[PDB]
Structures are given as C-alpha cells and as structure tokens.
Amino acid sequence: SQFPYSSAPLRSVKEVQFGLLSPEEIRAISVVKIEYPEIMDESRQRPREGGLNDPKLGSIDRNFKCQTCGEGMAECPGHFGHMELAKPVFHIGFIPKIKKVCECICMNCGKLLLDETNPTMAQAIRIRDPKKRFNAVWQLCKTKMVCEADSRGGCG
Amino acid sequence: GVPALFRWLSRKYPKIISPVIQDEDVDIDGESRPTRYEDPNPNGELDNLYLDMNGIVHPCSHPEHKPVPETEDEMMLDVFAYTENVIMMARPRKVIYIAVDGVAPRAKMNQQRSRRFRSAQDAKDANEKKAAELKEMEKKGEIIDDAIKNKKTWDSNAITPGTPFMHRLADSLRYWAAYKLTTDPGWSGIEVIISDASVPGQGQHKIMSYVRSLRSSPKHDPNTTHCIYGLNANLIFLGLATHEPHFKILREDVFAQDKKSYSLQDQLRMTDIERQELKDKKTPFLWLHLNILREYLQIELNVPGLSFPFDLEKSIDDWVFICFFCGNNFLPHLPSLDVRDNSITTLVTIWKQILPTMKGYLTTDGYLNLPAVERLLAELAKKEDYIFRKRYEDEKRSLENQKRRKKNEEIRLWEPGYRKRYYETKFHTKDPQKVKKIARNMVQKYIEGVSWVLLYYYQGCPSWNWYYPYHYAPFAADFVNLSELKIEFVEGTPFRPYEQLMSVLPAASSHNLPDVFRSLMSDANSEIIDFYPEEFPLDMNGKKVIWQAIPLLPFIDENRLLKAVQSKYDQLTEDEKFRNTNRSEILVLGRSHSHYPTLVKELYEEGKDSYEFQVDSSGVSGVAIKLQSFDRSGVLRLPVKQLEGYRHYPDISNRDFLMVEFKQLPKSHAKSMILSGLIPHLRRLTQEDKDSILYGGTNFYGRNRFSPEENADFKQYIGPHGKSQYLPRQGGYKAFIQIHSDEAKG
Amino acid sequence: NGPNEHPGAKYVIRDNGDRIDLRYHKRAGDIVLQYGWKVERHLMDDDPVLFNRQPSLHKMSMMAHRVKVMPYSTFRLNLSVTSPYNADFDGDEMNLHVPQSEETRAELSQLCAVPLQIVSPQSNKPVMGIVQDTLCGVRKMTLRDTFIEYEQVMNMLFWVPSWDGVVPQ
Amino acid sequence: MFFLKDLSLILTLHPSYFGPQMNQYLREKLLTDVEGTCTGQFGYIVTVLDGMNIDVGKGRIIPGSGSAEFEVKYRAVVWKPFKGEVVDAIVSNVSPIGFFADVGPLNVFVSTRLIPDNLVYNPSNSPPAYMSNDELITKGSKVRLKVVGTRTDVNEIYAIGSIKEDFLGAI
Amino acid sequence: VSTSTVGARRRRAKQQVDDEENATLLRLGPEFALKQYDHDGNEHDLIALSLSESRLLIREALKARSRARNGGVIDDDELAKVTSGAVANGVVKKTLDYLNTFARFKDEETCTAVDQLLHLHPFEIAQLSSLGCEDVDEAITLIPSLAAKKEVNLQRILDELNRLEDP
Amino acid sequence: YLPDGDIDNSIDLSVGSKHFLLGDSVELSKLDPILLALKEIEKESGAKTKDRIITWRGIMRKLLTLPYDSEEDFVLDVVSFDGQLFIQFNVPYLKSKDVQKQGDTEFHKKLQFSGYKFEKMATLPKPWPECTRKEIDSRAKSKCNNIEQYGAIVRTGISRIKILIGGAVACTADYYDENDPLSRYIELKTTRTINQYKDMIAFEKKLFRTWAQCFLLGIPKIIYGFRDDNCILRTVEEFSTNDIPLMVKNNPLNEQPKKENCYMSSINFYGAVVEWLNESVKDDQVWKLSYAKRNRQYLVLKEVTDENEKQQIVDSAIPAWFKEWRSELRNS
Amino acid sequence: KNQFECRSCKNKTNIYQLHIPYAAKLLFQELMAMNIAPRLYTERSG
RNA sequence: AUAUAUGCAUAAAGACCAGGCU
C-alpha cells in the first residue's frame, strides 16, 4: 500500500500467454533506436543520445528522472529499445527446432512434404496438442525426401 | 542558478512556492480551441492583477538566451504576446493595472545613473568586440549581411521616460488594451488602468499607492484577491506591506528553468523552425502565495515572554523593515551585514533576542521608533565583533583552501581599531575631528535614508529630492544617541521627463534624446560637461562580479543641472514639449461594461467636468475626468507596422470603448491592520512545519531539490474559504455544536 | 516509552501512509494518536511468531510459538520440542519470523501452533515426548520404593500450575 | 448524442460501513460516481435510470485489506459526439478567431476558416455578431453545425464544428 | 472508470484499418455496434434515443429519483436540484437547458404518436426524430444516410413529419 | 470593527466597573425622542401620518416574548390621543423597579457593565479609514455609560396595523447606507460560554428573546461575545436574524424537542395582541395592561376612571410641547 | 498528470495495474530481451 | 526591470575464489 495512487484498476493475473516477439511488435514497443557504440560524449556526464544508456530507456538514479515515464527510479519499470541488424541471425535456443522445420516443409515452395491425402498424416493432423502433433508430423515427413509436383502446388 | 533572497525563502519556507497550470494548447488535429476566457481558472479565481510592465518589456527588449528580436515593431508585438500570455495565465476578472516605471525620485537617481552608465559602457565594449570579430572573419572570408553591420545592439538605455520609444510603447499599450476590451467577450466586466512612463512614480510604488487608495474607501471589499507580476524579489516584502491576506505573486520559474548560455551563433544563423519552437516554448511560471507566508510568520514570530500583547501586523511590519534594512536600492548595505540575505538570517534572531526586553515595536505604520532601532543596532554592534570574525575567517579559510588545492584597500579589518583606518581608506582624511564629524553626518543621513525608504513603501513618497551623498555606510556602533537626530522631508516636485532623461542618460546614448540637448553632452565648451566623463574609477570593495563593485562617480549637482536644463526650453517643438510634461493615469472602459452608461451620462451628456467613483462594479475608486483629445467618432489604429503572421490587428473604432483621465482618492494616513469582514483562507500548515520552524525536528534536513511540484494543487488554499469572519474556537455556540456533532459522528 | 526502552514503539504510521520515526522525534511525550493510524510497536509477550530450523524436512520443523521476552542473547526452547526440530544445544542457530498482519497472525495461531502439531500424520503417532533428564527422572520417581515427606510434597504440589489446591491423602 | 448504454462499475466499501443500510450507501455511491462523468470509450454520461432498486450483487472481500468489492450492473443514458454528425446548438462567445457553441455539456468550437465568407464579424454591433445579407449570428442564437473532430482528455470531450456546407447556419 | 459488456478484443497479428469513427460511412465503432449484449448476454439491437425520446426518459428518470428520495411529490431547476454534486448538478442543468429548448415533441401524446409513426439503422430514426427536416434535398444534404437506402420514399415520410408530427 | 487579534488577546471585560455610570429609568423610558422625530416628520410632511401604535422597541419585545419567556412582570400605560396610541412603562412601576433594582447585589451590574464594555471595545466612533491610531488603542481607557446612545425610529406593519417603533442601535457594519439604512445595522450581545446541555438551553432561550428584540427593527446581523466566569472575552461569532429559526429548529444535538416552532406562534401571538389593542381601546381613553406571576395564563387590561390619575398619567406620558404642537397642527 | 498509453496497441483506456515481485518483473523483462513474449492477462479467454 | 550564477547536508559496488560452521 506504499505505492503512489493510480487510477488504473487493480486485479490479479489469471492467464499467462507465451509466444515469440514479432519484429513489428519489437519495433512498436521500443522507444529509442540504439546505434552508437560509444557511451559517453566527451566524459562530462550527459550520456550519448541513442546509445546503450540513453535516458529514454529508464532512470536508475535520483539525480535525473526518466524522460519517458516521468517518475523516479522507485516507480519507473524501465523501457525497451530496438537495434536493427544488418543481416538475420539464428537464435541459439531455436537452432534444432528450425532444422526440424527444414525437414518438414519444402525449401522452394515452402510447402509440407505430405498433405491430408495420406491417411497417417490425416490422423496426425487431428491431434489437439501442438507439441505432439508437430512431433508426429516431423516423424512422418522426415522419411520422404522429394517434393511432389502433383495438385498440391509442389515445385517438383 | 537561483538567486539569493529567494533561495533562502525556498529553504526556510518551501511550502509557499507553487507551480502554475500553463495551458492546454492544441487538442484536435489542425487548429484547435483557444481556451476561452470564461472557463474557471485552475490556479484559483483572481480579481485584481497588477502588472509591472517594465519588467515585461525589458527582457523582451534584449533577451539573454532567446535570440534578439530585430527592429522595434517586432519588439512591440513580442511584448503584446507576452502580456497576453501572462494575463491568460493569471486570468483577472476585475482590473488589470498596467504600470510603467515613470520618473524616479532623487534617492534612486544615482543608482539609475550608474546602471545606465554601465549598460552604455558594456554595450559599447560588446559591439566594439563584435565589430572586431566581424572584421577578423571578413579577413577569413565569412559573409556578413547588412542587417548585422548597420544594425548595432539595441540601447537598453532607451527604457527611460521621455524617450520616443516610451511614447510609442504607451500608444501601443493603449491600442492593445482598447482592442482586447473591444474584441474579447471575457473582458466585458473589466476596467484597464494604464499608468505609462509619463506619470511620475516607479512601478511597484504606483501599485502600492493604488492599493492604499483602494483601502481608504470605507465601502471597499476586504475579500478581494490581488496578484502582482514582477521580476523583482522585493515585491515579496511589498505585498506584506499592503496587509491584504488574499495576495499572490506570479513570477517566472527559476528552479526548472534550465537556462543554457547561448552565443551569437545561436542567435543569427539558427533556423526559423527552431525560431518558432523557441517562440512557442512554454516557459514555466511560479505562484508565490503571500497568505501562506503570513501563516508561516504568525508562528515563527510568536516569541513568548512579552510585556505587551502580540500583534502579527506590527511583527510583519518589523520583519519587512529588517528586510529593507538588510538590502535596498536607495541605500548602500552596511559593512557588517553583508553576503545579502544571510544578514536577514542574523538580525531577525537579534530581534528575537531583543524583543522581550524592549517595550515598543520597531516601526509604527511606517514610522520608526528611535530607541528600539537604536538598541537593536547597539546589539548588532555588540555582535559585530563575532560577525566580522566569522566573515574574515570565511575569507581566510577560502584562501587556505585555495592554497591547499592549487582606494588602495589593504585595510586589514581583523586588526583592532579598524574603524579609523577604514575611514581614511574611504575618505583620505587623517584628521580625527573631521573623521568624527563625517561619521556623525553619515549616521544622521543613513537614519534619514532608512526613514525615507520605510515611508516610501508605506505612506507614499515623502520627498522627491532626497539623495544619499556618500558611497558607503557606517557600522552599527556608529549609530549611537539616535534619539537626538531629527528627520524632516519636503515633498517638492518630481522632475520633468527631460530632466530625468538628462540625469540618467550618458553621452554615448544620446541618439534617442532630442538634438537640442545633445550639445550639452558632446560640446566641450558646455558648462555641464563634467557630469559625463568617458571613464570613471571603480571601487571593488572585495568581490568578483564586475558590476557589483562600487561605481565611483562624481555626485550630480542639482542646481546648475536645473539651470542648464531650463536654459533650453525655447528650442523644443510642440511634440517635445508635450513629451516633457507629467499627466495622470488613464482608465479604459468597455462598451458593454455596466459602468459605461453611467460614465457616459455623467461626462459626455451632463457636461460635468469630474465624476466621483467610490466603490463600483470593477472595484476601482477615484475621480474620472473627461479627456479632450479622445474623439468618439475617430478610429484608433495600431501604431506598429504589421509583420507576417502576428495575429493581424484590425482598426478599432472609438465608439466601442471609453478612455478617461483617472485620479486616485485623496491621500490619507494609512494604518497597518486588517479590515473587518475578512474571511481567512483555509488553514494550510498541519502540525509538521509548525513545530519544525520552532524546534530542530526536521528543519536542518537538507532536501536540495526544492522542486515546487510537491504541492501541485494550490487550489483550495487561495480563496477565502468559509462564510464566517471569526473561525470557531473554544466555547462558541456554533463551535460547541460542531465539536459535539463531530464527537457523536466519530 | 520510545524505541530505546522496552516495551516501546519504533515508527508511527499516519492515515495517508506517512511515517514518523520516534528515534529522531525528541518531542514524542506530547503526541496524540488518531484512529486508523498504525504504530510499529516492539515484540511483546504472547505474540505468535514462526520459528524454524534448517533444513526443513517436514512441517514440524517450522512452528508457531508465543514470544516471551527474556534477557541474554539466546533463544529459549522447551526440551520437548527439540526432537521435532532435530536440534540440540551445542551451537545450533535457529530462525524466527514475525507476521505483520492480523490475518496471518490468526493463520499462525490457528494452523501452525505448536500444540496442534503434537500428533503427526506420517505415522499417526506423537512426535513430541518426555525426553532426556525428565524421562530418566520419572523412571527414578515412579519406583515402588520412592517416598516423599510432607514438606517436599507441598513444594511439589505448589510447583504444579494446574493443581486444584487439594492435598491428596 | 443521446444513447442508451449498459455499464458496470466496481465499488469499494470500507469495513466501517458494514451495516444494515449498506445497500442504500452503495446506491448513493453509484449515483454520485456515475452521473456527470465522462469516459473515452462511452462519452459523457447523462444519468442513470431505475437506480432506486438496482442490484448491487454480493461483495468481494479483498484478502489483506478487508474492504468489499461490488460489481454493480446498470442501465444508463449517455451522450457521445460523432464525427460528421450535424447538430443544432446555441452559441455562447463570438470572436474573430472563432466562436463557441453548446451541445449539452459539450462545447464545440468553430474556427474562422469554417464560416462562409458572406458572414463578417463586427465588433461595433451590440452584441458583437457575425452579420451578412439577411444573416445574423449574435450570442445565444440558434445555429446548425457539423462535427468535424473529437478529442478526449478522460475528464472532458472537445469538438470542432464547421458550417461550410449547404443547409447549415442560423435558424 | 466504468466498463461495459463489450470487451476482450486482444491484440492480433494483423491490424485493422477500419477503426476511426465516421457517421457518413455509418460506422459507430465497437462500443456502439449494431448488436449489444444485455445482463444475460443475449443479443439486442442498438438503442438510439431521439431528443423527444431523450426528454421523456430524462423526465421519467428524474421523477423516479424524486420518488425514491423525497417520496411522492415540474421545473428544470428543480430537477437539477434533485441530484447532488457540483459537477453532476452543472451537467444536468446544462443538458436540460439544451434539451428542453430543442425538443421537437414535448408532450406524451405526440411522443406516443411518433412511437407509432416510427414503427433500419437506429441512427436514422434518431436523426429523423431529432433535427428538423422540411425538404428531401436538405434531408439528404444534411446527412447522407437518407441519400442511399434503395427504399427511400422521403416524400411521404417527410410529409408525415411535417403534418402528422410537429411541423 | 473587531479582528481576530482582539479575540486571541483575551481582552478583559470587567475592567473599569468601579466608575460605571447608570441612567435613570424614567428618563430613558420617556417617549421624548420618538415624539420629537414625529414633530419634525409632521412639520416637513404637512399632513398626519398613517401609523397607529407609537412606542419603544423594548415594550413590543417584552409583549411579544411574554408567552414563552415570562420571568418579568410588567404594567404599561396606554394613551389614546388623536387616534394614535402611546405605550409607556407605568411610572409607579418604574419607581418600584428602581427600588427593587437598587438592591440587586453586584453580579448583575457586573454583567451589564461587561456587556457595555464589549459594546464599547468592539466599535469605533468613526469609520476605520478616518480613524487614527489613538482612537483605536484608547477604547479600553474610555468611559462606559447607558445614557450616551444612538437610536432609530422605524415604521413597521402587521395585519392591518401600523406601528412606529423607536429603538437603540448599537452600531453599523461599515458605513451609513442612505438607500437602505436597516441593511447595514448590527446588534451586539454578551452571553456566558457554552459547555453543556444546560448552557445550550439557556443560550437558545436568550437567542429567542434577542431575536424577538432584533426582528422588530429589521436588523439583519447580530454578534455575540461569549465570556467565561472571569469576565474575559473567550470567543465571538455571528448570526443572521432570518437564519436563527432554521438553525435553532435543525439542531443536530436536539433535533426534535418540540414539533411546534416558537417563532411562528410568537409572530401569531404578536398579531393577535396588536389587533386586540387596535380594537380594544377607543378614542380619548387611558388604559392599563399588566402581566405578573399570579396569572400565568392571560394578560389583564383595565380602564382607569379617576380624573386625577388620568390627568397625571397624561402629564407624565406626553410632554407639553408635543401637546401644543399637536394643537397647532389641528388648528392649521 | 494521470496519462496511461500503450504505443503498440494505441491504447489509453484498457490498462490495468498489478502487484508482483520485482524478481518476476526482472524475469519478464529478460524473457522479452530473449525474444520471448510472456503476456499477462487478467481475464480467462476460455 | 532585475540583477548574475562565483553552493550544494548521505550515497548504497556487485560478481567470483578460498577456508570454515551444523
């Protein structure tokens, strides 16, 4: 009850939804773009604008308040930024799973090697749980090694 | 950086300073609503607003950081915009008093002359260095436009009554007031009083005199609320002299105003988009409430153990007198009491140490009590040994720290018998009898000067001819046998605008002054050539600021200066003679105002020469006189050439407003006490600062931020909360009912 | 009384949440409390506190006790609660937690209280019993050839808190 | 403009008011805190209907605080501005930079750019007015406008209107 | 502060463009859509109140509040004084002063006749029973809802509005 | 003029009681000023007035306050002259009252002087802007008496009856209003400090009495200085004459003592008694009305038939100059 | 100044407040930094 | 017109390594 009063209603978390952050969402939630390698300007405080310690990111000291939320370090939860990459980079935690996807879809038309015509694939589709459904699809589609031209839209 | 005399009241009274609710500006896309006047003021309702117009026109004549406007039409438009913003921020609903500093009295004349001389000198040095740099980079190949070569720096000495610029400013202010009254639906019930530079007086003095004249009417409402806008901090002590609790001061913000120094490159070649951004940069403002200050001083000054009943009004008067004694423009500060406001910190405690023993108050309705101030100064002299020891110890400790980390003066005040050596250092006289006589005369003149200063802000100007004939002041123990001294004043007559123009303007800033008197500064055969030397000595007295040093100058001789001035009235034209006269205030009244039909009937219909007001709808009081030059069938045009995109001003017909000559009520001996029927504001101090200002409980805990945002409401604490003059207390019937109703409920 | 003298208080919480420190408040002798305020008083007698020894193998290793303020710097324990805590007095260190709300005080008093934990659900048998010297003592006390004179009987009867005041034949 | 809406409010009741008259106290809180307010999603709230016997439901005891939370569902009448909707109004202030008009509690501002060139402001008129050939708009005169913008500050709604279309003007 | 029955509408991968409000395109936003939900969650049509209907419902609500508070006892000032709170009182007097002067049908018999006559987007009937209409051209010029209906018959309905209802 | 500083300073009210001056009851109760002002209004009017009963304020105050606050006996003489009514205190009753008052110990005179001292201390002889500092700080060093006074004569009406009421006015708010003098008038009274229910009841009774006193002259505002048993001004507060009945009835501590408001019935009784006097006395008649302890149910009125008693009552009631001026007016 | 805004969803009204451990806040921020989006919803979609 | 600023009365190192305690 020591927090300052807020007009927003207070409740409790009832559901937690997990997922991946899309690049559009990452750009939207960000408040500043980080592009300058340097930290200080000429070593007289006043950190670099757009650097790793931009004042818009947040406030960690009572001398300067946050430039985005306007509160001190006791209330500001911190604000995220975005950094654009020149080339795409793999995710180390997603190295194997992507490869598994590479064994499921075609590398030219981006289509699955098997369709609903196959009976085993048809049964594997009806699995409600995504994890075991994906496991079954990968196990069934890793055996075939050629994209079928016929149609299913395959490139042959 | 916050200045002194204001940082101290931030430290000691942090709770009176409040921020301002600026505006709302644009809400919908494209153009938006202009925030019409009739909406309630979020800062609290305000009736009377008194504007110190000189403090509005001077910084928006030469901004320090904002790039300098060119020409003078843009200057007038900028003044119009700033005044409109200030009025919309304060939102007065009864009276706007536009007061411009007129002909100053003789007491301030020496300071005025020093300030004008320094302004001319450093402006000349600055433009000489600027031209040298222009030539230097011309040798480097830089291109300079004609708007920068021929156009020199604007002379700040032009802010002086009698110059054509003041006439243009007065005409522009009259036109702007008439236009605002005739086009704004929210200004229908407002009377605008203009007291331009033609009217003798000085700004805040005119405001104080008007408030005093208002208080002299028995029908005056004591619940009216006043506000003063001004850059001078002394107004903080001026409002407490009015003894009107519903009082406040609007000031430019100092804490949050991160003033960044800008060079000429940040003025000349910076872009027009940034020009508009700086124009639209909402400068924060501070509300400084004086009722909260009175609440603080009611508890602070309530020292126990007194042989006489405690009166908060006389204590307020004594506190204001001490504050004026510590520092004022008319008299130089004492040698002992120095480092500005810390002196105020000292004497008050001295007063607290001497009040129980003394039987009488220091001042009574602006009149000094000689024995009381004499014993106060005697105790100050007794402590002068410790004060001099402390300040010289601070100086020597600064010298030691500097050593560790890295007219001839040489007085050495730490040695005994420093008074005589200081006397021959400042006077070059070794005769003990002459030194004693000079010291006695200086003491008598300084007593007369503090009396003059205290009467000036309390009972009007007592003498327009008095002036301090020295450059320094004696120490406290020189003030002995003060009851024997006699003080007398002669009212005299205020000087003509041309006389003050002669007195304060230098020889290097005579372009604005008419060519008739130019030979009185330029010709070497002139009999008054000696009052304007090219260079003058400066006595530092020990400091580092250039202009804070003593400006050693030949004192003006009044008699022959007068003779020279009156020897050359026959060469002036009709307009120059009309600019060399003193007139009365101007009252401007709307067509839809309730007082308009009555004034028209009593002036332009009944043929009467004068009409008496007393209390009216707008709360003014005085005498209205028909003004001959005002033709009702004419058209009032803007005296300023219109620039691009500055809110095009149409031509105002004279049938839509009335302009009359205004006089105040006859002068009377004003008392220092609250009127009957006053409704106190809602109590704002709650059992924390009340004992913090008394004991050491959370008083020295330094919170070095002092941001005014900690209150952020300042709304219910403005108007006269309640409907009873006397608050419930002890065993009154209504109080009894209230307290037992509360007890039954809880 | 102040924070330096027991019993006393440390802080005074206003209705709006402002805190007054009694250490720096030297004029606390003439302060009045308002209804709805909170006073952070010292730990008094009969205050339920959680009391724990690590590692906590089972629920009996963390129980609610009643505070008795005593001199010296060691926690005092009954000898019968050492076995559920699996503790001895050769240098053991134990922890104490103070609830800060009425609901959690009631929860500790009605759920985690020591008397409610005498019988454990692991083997439907008690986990606290008469141990160490007392046990040996009763073996030397209830022997057939043990006889007590009148004065010692009166002293022992008075030593019983739950004695009914009737001397048996 | 006037719409009928279904609203729900969460009300917190202190334990000090846990008495037999708590239903009436909750009703009084609802009456105080609904009418006269404005919201971004719903607009200005005009008033509530059938509030004498509204169902307050059962309270929710907040753990650790002891206050009771009530979810009150009710039927109310509200007022919300619309883009492009024409409406009749009575004007209040007339200025060269524009003039205001009142539609219920809402103030709609019409800028000078949005008046046809036939109407001309004149300060000499009593009261000051926009006049034209057989056209007169003083203070307090009935006018027709079309909303061309709305913006919300949670507490209030601000709108701008235009009279630059056919069959729009004073009536 | 207050909430309605319609909610949820969490974030989706693809954003929606048709979000801004415009009465010319007959778009009212998610809050005031064609179908709303009652206490039990059943689908119901949007309820639009015309100025005469709004006047009747406000008078009924104020008289019900007077019955609840005073207990069985006419003027706009009295109805404004029925409620409490400075903001609420100001809002209610402002809306009553706006509504009484611009109410086309101020009597209950004409209100009942309009009910019947009215007996189609509710915004259309609200705007027809809200603002004065005398000609087909001005009716379609003021708001384009009547311009494109494909079953217009504005002649007969406007003749009814001018003669059967209050001219 | 009285700021909060005077209240905070605990101004004593019993100081100077040794040299307090008293006025004669007969001289102060005479109708000389009212009859005189009648003489000027008659001279500069030229025709007889429309008033019916001519009297002081205190007589009607007591006669209206009687039904509910009746701890004082009164006998009054009524003279019907030229169609007008003159009401005065009975001269034998005046001397009996003086005799019984001469032995009233010292507490009652102490309270009376405390009230007069509060009146002297709370007011100024001139408006505040025209007053000096000597005339403000010397209020406590002045002389207090009841002879020195200022009064107003006001025409009031009730039912179909016109009354010319003379009454003393303590002071005015800030200035004299020529448009409506009665709007700025103000009355000052002193009561003991309130500390319990008995004090509440006593103060409500005093409030009803002084409201009856003040409402006759139409004075809107009243001021009350509450003092302790040491005659020290403890507090001060304001009241409005029109607002007294509503706040008295709607008292949170005692919301329902009585379903019958005393004020409305007091007005009704005043109307009944004034019409009773209107059509109970004929022309050229002298009557005596009375109320004492023994009745407690009714007021007694009798007609005097003694020639000597009637002549002496007329002589002691109406001065010779008024009679001769009336005769001159009748002749002219 | 009582201003709540969400840049991504252009929201200013449907915003709630929660009381959570600071370690939970740090964990959620780190998960966001690792391209994982844990969304806290106060209502059950069902 | 003010007047310069020449001033600041609490900030919280954390991460690893080694040796012991029950």
Ligand SMILES: [Mg+2]
């Ligand atoms: Mg062990």
Ligand SMILES: [Zn+2]
């Ligand atoms: Zn932040």
Ligand SMILES: [Zn+2]
């Ligand atoms: Zn393929």
